[PDB]
Design a protein around this nucleic acid. Structure first.
Ligand code: CL
Ligand code: MG
Length: 667
DNA sequence: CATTCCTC
DNA sequence: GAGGAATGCAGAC
DNA sequence: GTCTG
């Protein structure tokens, strides 16, 4: 038998990996249960003809920020060079010789993001990619952005072709497998959207990703599977680049010449046919920012796009660019100028970095990683920042820049990848800008060698304490596996099924005017004459359940019922189509539930007060028993309908697959 | 995490 | 319009 | 009251 561990941000993320495996693997024997109170498992026996295999997947929901688990699995990434504070959605490990070894990192993205949102999470791919551990970025193509007021669809937005290409270039540079894989989203409707007329459906990688995962679990040669996935990532670059105006963006022939190794991104013969022209909003301008931008536009050549936040100053024009920068900011020191004038191409990245109050820009954290993925981390990068800094930030820059990098993820990104950091920033509470020219070359070189303490890691299945993650794991296990077809809902979408169709609402907002998005929505069809939709919220303590949370969960489902579902499909047939017919709330029984951990500190009066405060129809008080390890579940119904649900759960707390022996239902 | 704002 | 620039809320601490 | 999703 081989044992694997799925370390995820939550049980849903862990189960997504199992669903990928199970989509290709048709197992002969499947057994579910818990190895510990926090760790569910799935044990499978499957065969490849005559060859039988026995695997067990132990799931570890919720990553550390020794915070939750006794040791952090993410430490194995920082030991191999992942110096950014980047957490993927899932880490699959193999248990061998009493320790864990990372097989791959997986990140799930609900939509093909566009603009600076496309590279917002590029730090994850850059940092995990330079470790040698594969990084698989799985994105749904496509999901429409909605106007949350009326759920009407906004026009499709696509990332710059350089974003999907950065994964391929990072793969080439690092010798590691870093790829962007596209899964067919329910809203992929090419018959109705003209933007998708030239999309090649061979780019979809559902079968290929499952084949790759299974081959890695089997310790098989993945070279051929990797090449198929890389080719699909390259076809996305072709789809995107052939849909953009060639005048100020790279053509597919240019990307292809870089891909096949004919030229590097900085020695392209056609480099310069468009310049690097950074767009700065008027409201953002201060100090000598506008004149610096003019100096850049005087010597720059465009890198992939004329308006991306970065470009190249070729070594042939570097001396004149440096001379102009020194004349603008009154840099006279001969030692400083000598460092700036090194004979090599210079990549100039210009970022505001900070919002009006001095708070860091989330998308900017992936800007330098994107540059490093495209042109190599060893390339000389000149980072120019012009946004407002709080007095504490400028003080740390002049005292110990690494101390600032340690507290803030954006500063971490800047200090780790810039050879020169130039600030021309307003300081909050001060009348004028502060200028800094930081020769960060030695520091960057040291950071690119920094690795955390080498140590074998075996995450103990029992955490420091049980909290929201554990409540969520228990709620998901009971309602999704123990209690007996419908998908239900979560933060990614709500599905409602009948005898012919499945209706699905995508792009769920966190809140509506009167509602709050439930953690889980459970559909029960064989209890009442109408289907039941049970909306659940999970918290660590009963007092964490906010006032009227139960009423807000129902009002959220009522909000979705006010609109035609995003998509629908015939369960018997297939293929997702756009929503045609509206659903009616009277066709369903809606109930709300609040789940939490309670160690018998709640009296009859306390339960009565929780019901009065939250308005929940059902309260699920969960408590762990240590010897023997068991989850004691106490279901407290508020009314007669919820009591019928409690009886249904108690009667159906039986399973041929799930080991119900780990639970004790008091009532 | 995501939506609106602003420049070419 | 295209699409990068520029925002802020929220939850957890 | 800060950091990050
Ligand atoms: Cl194409
Ligand atoms: Mg992720």
């Amino acid at each position: 038998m081989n044992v694997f561990r799925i370390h995820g941000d939550n049980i849903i993320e862990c189960e997504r990996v199992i669903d990928l495996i199970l989509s290709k693997i048709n197992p002969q024997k499947v057994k579910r249960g818990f190895i510990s109170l926090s760790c569910p498992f799935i044990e499978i026996i499957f065969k490849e003809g005559h060859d039988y295999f026995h695997w067990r997947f132990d799931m570890f929901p919720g990553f550390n920020k020794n915070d939750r688990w006794n040791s952090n699995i993410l430490d194995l990434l920082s030991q191999k060079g992942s110096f950014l504070y980047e957490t993927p959605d899932v880490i699959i490990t193999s248990l061998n010789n009493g320790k864990e070894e990372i097989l791959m990192a997986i990140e799930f993205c609900s939509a093909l993001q566009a603009g600076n949102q496309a590279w917002q999470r590029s730090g994850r791919a850059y940092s995990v990619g330079r470790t040698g551990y594969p990084y698989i970025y799985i994105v749904d193509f496509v999901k429409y952005e909605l106007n949350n007021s009326d759920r009407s669809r906004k026009n499709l937005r696509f990332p710059n072709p350089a974003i999907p290409y950065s994964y391929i270039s990072h793969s080439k540079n690092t010798g590691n497998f870093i790829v962007q894989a596209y899964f067919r989203g329910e809203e992929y409707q090419p018959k109705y959207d003209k933007k998708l007329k030239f999309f090649d459906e061979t780019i979809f990688a559902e079968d290929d990703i499952a084949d790759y995962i299974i081959a890695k679990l089997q310790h098989r040669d993945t070279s051929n599977i990797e090449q198929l996935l890389i080719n699909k990532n390259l076809k996305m670059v072709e789809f995107l680049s052939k849909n953009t105006k060639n005048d100020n963006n790279f053509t597919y022939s240019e990307w292809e010449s870089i891909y096949n190794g004919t030229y590097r991104i900085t020695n392209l013969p056609s480099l310069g046919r468009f310049k690097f022209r950074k767009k700065i909003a008027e409201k953002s301008l201060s100090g000598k920012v506008k004149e610096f931008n003019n100096i850049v536009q005087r010597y720059s050549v465009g890198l992939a796009s004329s308006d991306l936040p970065f470009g190249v100053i070729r070594k042939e024009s570097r001396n004149d660019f440096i001379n102009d920068v020194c004349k603008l900011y009154n840099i006279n020191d001969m030692k400083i100028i000598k460092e700036l004038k090194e004979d090599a191409d210079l990549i100039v990245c210009m970022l505001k970095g900070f919002k009006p109050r001095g708070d860091d820009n989330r998308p900017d954290r992936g800007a330098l990683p994107l540059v490093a993925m495209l042109a190599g981390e060893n390339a000389q990068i000149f980072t120019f920042i012009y946004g407002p800094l709080i007095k504490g930030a400028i003080n740390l820059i002049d005292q110990d820049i690494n101390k600032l990098a340690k507290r803030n993820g954006l500063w971490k990104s800047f200090v780790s990848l810039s050879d020169f950091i130039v600030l021309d920033c307003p300081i909050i509470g001060e009348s004028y800008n502060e200028f800094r020219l930081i020769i960060n070359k030695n520091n960057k070189e040291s950071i690119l060698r920094k690795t955390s303490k080498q140590q074998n890691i075996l995450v103990d299945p029992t955490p420091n304490h049980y909290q929201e993650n554990d409540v969520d794991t228990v709620i998901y296990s009971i309602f999704k596996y123990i209690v007996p077809n419908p998908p239900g809902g979560d933060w990614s979408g709500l599905s409602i099924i009948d005898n012919v169709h499945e209706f699905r609402w995508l792009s769920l907002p966190r809140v509506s005017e009167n509602g709050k998005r439930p953690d889980h929505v459970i559909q029960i069809l064989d209890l009442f004459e109408k289907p039941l939709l049970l909306s659940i919220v999970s918290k660590e303590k009963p007092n964490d359940l906010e006032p009227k949370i139960g009423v807000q969960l129902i009002k959220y489902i009522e909000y979705l019922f006010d609109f035609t579902p995003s998509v629908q499909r015939k369960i018997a047939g297939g293929n997702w189509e756009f929503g045609n017919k509206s659903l009616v709330p009277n066709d369903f029984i809606l109930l709300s539930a609040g789940a939490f951990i309670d160690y018998d500190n709640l009296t009859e009066n306390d339960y009565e007060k929780i019901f009065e405060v939250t308005g929940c129809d059902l309260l699920i008080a969960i408590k762990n028993q240590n010897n023997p390890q068991k989850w004691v579940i106490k279901f407290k119904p508020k009314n007669t309908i919820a009591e019928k649900l409690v009886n249904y759960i108690k009667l159906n707390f039986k399973s041929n697959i799930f080991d119900t022996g780990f639970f004790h239902i008091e009532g």
